[PDB]
Design a protein around this ligand. Structure first.
Ligand SMILES: [Mg+2]
Ligand SMILES: [Zn+2]
Ligand SMILES: [Zn+2]
Lengths: 62, 49, 133, 113, 32, 39, 67, 137, 506, 147, 263
RNA sequence: UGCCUGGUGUCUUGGGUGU
């Protein structure tokens, strides 16, 4: 049931590399992540995300 | 504030009178309904106690 | 080739309101009763009172998009110091021998008074004026 | 809220070509060039360089809207010359001018250092 | 000493190669 | 209070500027009024 | 609130000249002479230091919320 | 102190210069030739004190059309500044604080007692009056 | 409150801004508003591919869609659908797609005094959060960009879209039935720049002419021959303006009985869309009747007339951008030779008023029939003072050079008039409250700084100074009284006029 | 401070603004047409006085009903090497060519008002309705409709 | 054919005269130096603790404006063009700041000298905040009183001034040509006489004033340009000029490559 | 195999914004 929803994530590629966000929408292959840095929400592919875990940053295998 | 209200309005209460010199601001007043009815004390004015 | 030719002596030069434009009034030396009122650009062709100007009017410069002239080609304008191109917006067939031709070179106005015989051929849509000094 | 990203002024999308050329058939030997993610810096340089070539009879450019980073240029040469060759010659000539300018500035700076 | 203590003729020698009433010197605490 | 160094410096500058203004503005006004009188 | 890092108009860095400006004013130099001594030529830069009001000295007087 | 009813019976001078008897820029004082002589009883402390708190911010209010003075008096109460120095410890429904307030370069003497120098509500911008690109019409 | 007028759906509201680079009948719509509003488009075999693309894009990507409506009326929300790509569209369904370019929308500003306050524009989606208008339409809306807001209403049907595009469209509303004259004309700095650009001594080089010609959308690709061919090719501003005018337009106007040689460059003569002489200003491209806009609308139709605004605005705006125009404090100043004339005129008027006062006080004053002695005296004094202000203002105006910026703005008709020059430079004049001079609010005097029974001009509200020179405290107070009267009169008459118009409409 | 309210129409970068010979670009450009009809001469006088004050390091005294005249400020401005009326020769940002008209130029005190567009923009397709009348509710905060 | 003549030279500003170039080329060079020369500036701030009276984003904005040495920024890569997951040492520079006030009296000033470079590209002279001298404390960042601490970690990236003004290497580029107005490119507003009402240009002595009897020359073009380049210290003046020229060359070469590959 | 949510008072009053 979209386990990565409402989880802190970091962007590793594209024009937003290294920005912390929170996943809001998880329909599929296109995740809506709100950014902490500006006040906006952007779409992003799943391959571009690094989901936070108990041990550092983990790629899209959470 | 001048409690004359809106009903039965007239231009004379809203006008800036000669005797207002030095006691209320000639420039500062709201816009619309309360124009002229709301006044601001001049910068050296006082009220007797 | 050329539709009119004469030599004029400048009577008056009026700058007036403007800085780059002058009104000059001239009468033909060979024939009085021919007048020329003209707007000119001061900065390019400055004139003074009592100057002598050779004025020529032609309907073509030969011997539609405008192009910068190549240095190799030659045209009628090679012999003159000031060439303008304008449209004739009035041909007053006036009294017995009083004919007025009004020409506007993009807002710079010219009026040519003269007899019918001299200005008969000037009934064209567009005219070049060629001034030499 | 509706403000676009600032990097869109110079970062080119993959599907958008940097340079699209379409002929202008109203007059002979004329082309219309659409530059993407460019502004007056390149446009004015190219225009004033091309205006001096004897074989270029019309060159102009315009920026349609300040809020979009692109400009469109109209070029029209003589019968002998293809316009794209004239554009390439202009680019190469400006590059050589900049190169000699850099060399001379370096020489002067070393002298006055 | 200061410019005032200078001789008037020597003050005349000080020529630029007067205060105005509407140029105040800035403050930070104001008053009231 | 134990005011900071910047605040103390600002207070000294303010006192000096107040004195200088009170002197110079008054002098300039006195210079101008006599000229306006004699005209 | 606190001296801006860059001049708004042109972009010269004026944030490192506040302390020097106050030191110069302390010694009796006039404001124009103090600004000239710091090499602030354009009046766009001069208005940044001349018209700055230092409010952080008032915010710091409140007791810190943590310890 | 005089009130609005005692003012009916007094003769006031506008400035201390009025107590005693060809430039294209300076203004013109009233001639007052109807009276052979005057016996003033009071003098105004300063005429610019007839203005209120909001109208004491305008510089050169006597060079302006009066409706513009009224509009500025209205709009000066909507300018974001620093309303108080303890805005951190206050819980207001709304609060707007300007990052870098600056005091005006052209100030008035009445701004000293309104603390406008210490809690200003604006900035000095380099303004150019021009028809540049048609986007400021 | 609920039947004659009610709140409605499918509408938006935000601040308006100006855009010189928009056609006359175009409005700039923010992206967020375009995403929020929608238009239900019926799926047919001409647009099923495009509509499927829109459905795939979803409600967050532009162009996109918000809902899919089946034949039975059920709504499929695309936010909460996990299988949006697994939706196939059948003919007859509706897709509530996003607002797109060239969609007709009704645009409105309150109060809606006349029918030109609601007009239909074409949508153009733009960044940032303000509605954007071509500045020629700011006149019918009575709108400016100091904070005004305007309303947008989206049609929701093919019939309603056709009605908006065929009846309320902006090009169809250029000429009004109220006074059979255009309601939209060239305004503000475009008017000022078309006056400056069409002066007799404005010449343009080849490289600038090429740029100016490329800016005209309707240009046919042929450069006109320059007015001056030798020694240097130069074009005049009239040529570049005539480039923007459609061919086949004839316009003739006589200003002050000028001859066909037009020594002062006044009047007008446009032959086959080419300007022969005459400076183009408010009398030609303004909103008055019989001008260029009215002629083009009658001759060529609403579409060409709408394109005329864009052509003229683009050319003039480019020229004025690369030429410049400003105004300064030096433009409100008159030399000493004129200031002494103004002072002498004002002193003479004050002496005349003093003589009238003496004559009235010694019963030597003639009485105007139907008016008392006091009324006749007051009328004569008011007339004398008004004539004084007019004379001083005329002297100041005649002083001004051609390069004066205020004079240029007044001459173009873009902004200001003669009274503004008079008051800024020469004399503010007499302040009238309720049609009379300043009354005696105190006991037999206007202020406690005057002696009793003083009828001198300065004692009853005659501001002798100018705005540049500055007002004395008494003049300041009297002028404030007059301004307060103006504000009150406006704020009171507006309600009476609104009631009258409502009764008339009912 | 003279009733000259307005809204931002567009933002240009540093290199697109007109600049003076010494590299100063304005923070803000206003139309000349704002002045003549409204007759806010105090705006121009304040700009001139502020220019002189920032050049000389003083604060101008703009108290009303004083003896300050425009000619004194102009003399002070001329003594500092600027045009006495405040004009400046200014260059075009796009092409670098001089502008044919000189530009009035100087610092002025501006203030930011509470009315921002992002607090006023509002749109509605469908949403809550009143219980009594089943018409759209009133208010931007409540996702209401327009009347 | 183009010529360069340097009038004054310094580490932070150079005053030079260009000649035998078109006005468009000089203006394009000025624009490129203003807004297209890449530099290095702080672009992400991770605030681990901030108990000062300033807001977190206030301090972040202040940090972004601090100039950093960008001498070897050419070797560095753009963040969006680096294939590395997260940020590596080849596309970012990590600086760390830690400030604290000890004692129950006094105020501590936090300067840009306290920014300590932690990681960055190997042997590249980038990232260090610019200092006027060895004893210059730098830009004032914040102020602290007792028990107030600021502990942040900042990441610097490469960018241009088009994206944000913090990446601009220049402050103000004075630009000027034709001091005596022989080309009549401007028309002088005046009240009595235009000659004595307008101040002379600072380069008026570098060109001969027109003769009283001289006629207007319609064949002349602007030929000599006087321009002064001031920098913020991140790049030297000569580096700014040379890199602006190189950036313009790269842009033109890219256009040429696009044209040649279009066919 | 553990499986995802749309539902928002009312009435007064005040202060404002654009005409
Ligand atoms: Mg408005
Ligand atoms: Zn600066
Ligand atoms: Zn990397």
């Amino acid at each position: 049931r979209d386990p990565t929803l409402n989880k802190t994530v970091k962007i590793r590629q594209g024009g937003y590399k290294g920005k912390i966000g929170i996943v809001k929408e998880a329909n599929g292959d296109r995740f809506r992540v709100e950014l902490h840095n500006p006040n906006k929400t952007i779409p992003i592919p799943c391959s571009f995300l690094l989901i936070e875990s108990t041990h550092g940053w983990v790629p899209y295998e959470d | 504030n001048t409690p004359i209200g809106r009903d039965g309005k007239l231009a004379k209460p809203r006008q800036l009178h000669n005797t207002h010199w030095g006691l209320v601001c000639p420039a500062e007043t709201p816009e619309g309904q309360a124009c002229g009815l709301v006044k601001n004390l001049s910068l050296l004015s006082g009220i007797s106690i | 080739s050329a539709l009119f030719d004469d030599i004029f002596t400048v009577q008056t030069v009026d700058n007036g309101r403007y800085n780059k434009v002058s009104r000059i009034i001239g009468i033909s030396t060979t024939n009085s009763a021919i007048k020329l009122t003209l707007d000119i650009n001061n900065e390019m062709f400055p004139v003074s009172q009592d100057d002598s100007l050779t004025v020529t009017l032609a309907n073509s410069l030969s011997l539609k998009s405008w192009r910068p002239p190549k240095p190799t080609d030659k045209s009628l304008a090679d012999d003159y110091d000031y060439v303008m191109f304008g449209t004739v917006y009035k041909f007053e067939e006036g009294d017995e021998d009083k004919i007025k031709v009004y020409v506007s070179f993009g807002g710079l106005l010219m009026c040519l008074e003269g007899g019918y015989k001299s200005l008969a051929s000037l009934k064209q849509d567009n005219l070049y004026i060629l001034i030499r000094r | 809220m509706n403000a676009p990203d600032r990097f869109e002024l110079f970062i080119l999308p993959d599907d958008v070509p940097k340079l699209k050329i379409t002929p202008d058939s109203r007059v002979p030997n004329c082309i219309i060039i659409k530059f993407e993610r460019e502004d007056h810096t390149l446009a004015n340089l190219l225009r004033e360089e091309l205006a001096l070539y004897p074989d270029v009879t019309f060159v102009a450019y315009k920026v349609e809207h300040p809020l979009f980073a692109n400009f469109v240029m109209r070029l029209q040469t003589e019968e002998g010359t293809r316009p794209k060759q004239a554009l390439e010659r202009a680019c190469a000539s400006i590059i050589n001018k900049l190169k000699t300018l850099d060399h001379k500035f370096n020489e002067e700076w070393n002298i006055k250092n | 000493l200061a410019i005032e203590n200078l001789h008037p003729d020597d003050r005349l020698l000080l020529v630029d190669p007067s205060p105005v009433f509407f140029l105040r010197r800035p403050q930070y605490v104001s008053d009231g | 209070v134990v005011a900071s160094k910047a605040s103390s410096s600002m207070l000294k500058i303010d006192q000096r500027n107040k004195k200088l203004n009170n002197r110079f503005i008054r002098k300039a006004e006195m210079a101008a009024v006599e000229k306006r009188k004699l005209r | 609130m606190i001296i801006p890092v860059r001049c708004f108009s042109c972009g010269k860095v004026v944030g490192d000249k506040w302390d020097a400006y106050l030191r110069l004013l302390e010694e009796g130099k006039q404001e124009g002479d103090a600004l000239d001594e710091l090499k602030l030529k354009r009046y766009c830069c001069r208005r940044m230091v001349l018209t700055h009001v230092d409010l952080i000295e008032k915010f710091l007087r409140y007791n810190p919320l943590e310890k | 102190y005089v009130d609005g009813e005692e003012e009916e019976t007094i003769m006031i001078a506008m400035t201390p210069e009025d107590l005693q008897t060809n430039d294209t820029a300076k203004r013109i004082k009233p001639e007052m030739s109807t009276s052979s002589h005057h016996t003033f009883t009071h003098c105004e402390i300063h005429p610019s004190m007839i203005l209120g708190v909001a109208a004491s911010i305008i510089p050169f209010p006597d060079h302006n059309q009066s409706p513009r003075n009224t509009y500025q008096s209205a709009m000066g109460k909507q300018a974001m500044g620093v309303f108080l120095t303890n805005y951190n410890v206050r819980m207001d429904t709304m609060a707007n604080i300007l990052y870098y307030p600056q005091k005006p370069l052209a100030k008035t003497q009445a701004m000293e007692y309104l603390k406008f120098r210490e809690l200003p509500a604006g900035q000095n911008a380099i303004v150019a009056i021009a028809c540049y690109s048609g986007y400021n019409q | 409150g609920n039947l004659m007028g009610k709140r409605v759906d499918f509408s938006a509201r935000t601040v308006i801004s100006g855009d010189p680079n928009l056609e006359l009948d175009q409005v700039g719509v923010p992206i967020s508003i375009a995403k929020t509003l929608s238009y239900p488009e019926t799926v047919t075999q001409y647009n099923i591919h495009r509509l499927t693309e829109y459905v795939r894009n979803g409600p967050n990507e532009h162009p996109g869609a918000k809902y899919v409506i089946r034949d039975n009326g059920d709504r499929i929300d695309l936010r909460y659908h996990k299988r949006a790509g697994d939706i196939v569209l059948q003919y007859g369904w509706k897709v509530e797609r996003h607002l797109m370019d060239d969609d007709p929308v009704l645009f409105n500003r309150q109060p809606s005094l006349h029918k030109m306050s609601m007009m239909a524009h074409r949508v153009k989606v733009m960044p940032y959060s303000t509605f954007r208008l071509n500045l020629s339409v700011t006149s019918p809306y009575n709108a400016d960009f100091d904070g005004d807001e305007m309303n947008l209403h989206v049609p929701q049907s093919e019939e309603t879209r056709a009605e908006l595009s065929q009846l309320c469209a902006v090009p169809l509303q250029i000429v009004s039935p109220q006074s059979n004259k255009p309601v939209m004309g060239i305004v503000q700095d475009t008017l000022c720049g078309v006056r400056k650009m069409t002066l007799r001594d404005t010449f343009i080089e080849y490289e600038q002419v090429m740029n100016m010609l490329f800016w005209v959308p309707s240009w046919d690709g042929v450069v006109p021959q320059p007015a001056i061919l030798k020694p240097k090719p130069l074009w005049t501003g009239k040529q570049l303006l005539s480039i923007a005018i459609p061919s086949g337009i004839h316009l003739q106007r006589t200003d002050g009985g000028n001859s066909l040689l037009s020594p002062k460059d006044n009047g007008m003569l446009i032959v086959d869309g080419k300007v022969m002489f005459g400076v183009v200003d408010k009398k030609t491209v303004g909103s008055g009747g019989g001008g260029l806009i009215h002629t083009v609308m009658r001759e060529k139709g609403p579409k060409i007339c709408a394109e005329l605004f864009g052509n003229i605005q683009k050319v003039v705006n480019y020229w004025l951008l690369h030429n410049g125009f400003s105004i300064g404090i030096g433009d409100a100043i008159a030399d000493a030779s004129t200031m002494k004339e103004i002072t002498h005129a004002i002193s003479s008027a004050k002496e005349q008023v003093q003589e009238i006062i003496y004559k009235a006080q010694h019963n030597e004053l003639e009485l105007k029939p139907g008016m008392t002695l006091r009324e006749s005296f007051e009328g004569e004094v008011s007339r004398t003072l008004n004539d004084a202000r007019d004379s001083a203002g005329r002297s100041a105006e005649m002083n001004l050079k051609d390069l004066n910026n205020v004079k240029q703005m007044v001459s173009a008709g873009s902004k200001g008039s003669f009274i503004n020059i008079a008051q800024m430079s020469a004399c503010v004049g007499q302040q009238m409250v309720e049609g009379k001079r300043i009354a005696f609010g105190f006991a037999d005097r206007s202020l406690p700084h005057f002696t009793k029974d003083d009828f001198s001009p300065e004692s009853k509200g005659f501001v002798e100074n100018s705005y540049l020179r500055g007002l004395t405290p008494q003049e300041f107070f009297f002028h404030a009284m007059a301004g307060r009267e103006g504000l009150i009169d406006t704020a009171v008459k507006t309600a009476e006029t609104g009631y009258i118009q409502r009764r008339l409409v009912k | 401070r003279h009733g000259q309210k307005g809204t931002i129409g567009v933002t240009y970068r540093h290199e697109d603004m007109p600049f003076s010979a010494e590299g100063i670009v304005p923070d803000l450009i206003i139309n000349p047409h704002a002045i003549p009809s409204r007759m806010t001469v105090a705006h121009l006088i304040e700009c001139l006085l502020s220019k002189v004050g920032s050049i000389r390091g003083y604060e101008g005294d703009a108290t009303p009903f004083t003896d300050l005249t425009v000619d004194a400020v102009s003399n002070l401005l001329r003594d500092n090497g600027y045009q006495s009326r405040g004009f400046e020769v200014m260059y075009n940002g796009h092409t670098g060519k001089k502008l044919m008209a000189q530009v009035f130029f100087g610092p002025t005190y501006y203030q930011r008002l509470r009315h921002m567009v992002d607090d006023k923009i509002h749109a509605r397709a469908r949403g809550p309705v009143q219980v009594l009348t089943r018409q759209p509710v009133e208010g931007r905060s409540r996702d209401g409709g327009l009347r | 054919e183009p010529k360069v003549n340097i009038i004054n030279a310094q580490d932070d500003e150079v005053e030079l005269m260009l000649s035998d170039v078109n006005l468009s080329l000089a203006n394009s060079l000025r624009r490129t130096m203003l807004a297209e020369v890449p530099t290095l500036a702080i672009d992400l701030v991770e605030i681990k603790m901030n108990t000062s009276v300033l807001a977190d984003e206030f301090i972040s904005h202040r940090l972004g404006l601090i100039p950093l040495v960008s001498e070897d920024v050419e070797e560095m890569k753009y963040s969006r063009d680096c294939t590395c997951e997260d940020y590596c040492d080849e596309c970012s520079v990590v600086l760390e700041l830690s400030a604290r006030h000890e004692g129950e009296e006094g105020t501590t000033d936090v300067y840009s000298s306290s920014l300590i470079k932690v990681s960055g590209p190997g042997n590249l002279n980038v990232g260090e905040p610019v200092r006027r001298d060895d004893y210059d404390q730098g830009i004032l960042l914040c102020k602290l009183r007792n028990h107030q601490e600021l502990n942040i970690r900042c990441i610097a990236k490469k960018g241009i001034a088009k994206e944000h003004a913090k990446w601009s290497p220049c402050s103000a580029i004075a630009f000027e040509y034709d001091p005596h107005n022989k080309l009549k490119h401007t028309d002088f507003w005046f009240e009595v006489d235009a000659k004595k009402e307008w101040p002379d240009s600072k380069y008026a002595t570098w060109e001969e004033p027109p003769k009283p009897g001289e006629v207007f020359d319609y064949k002349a073009k602007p030929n000599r340009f006087y321009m002064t380049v001031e920098t913020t210290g991140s790049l030297k003046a000569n580096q700014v000029f040379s890199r602006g020229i190189k950036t313009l060359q790269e842009k033109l070469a890219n256009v040429l490559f696009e044209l040649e590959n279009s066919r």
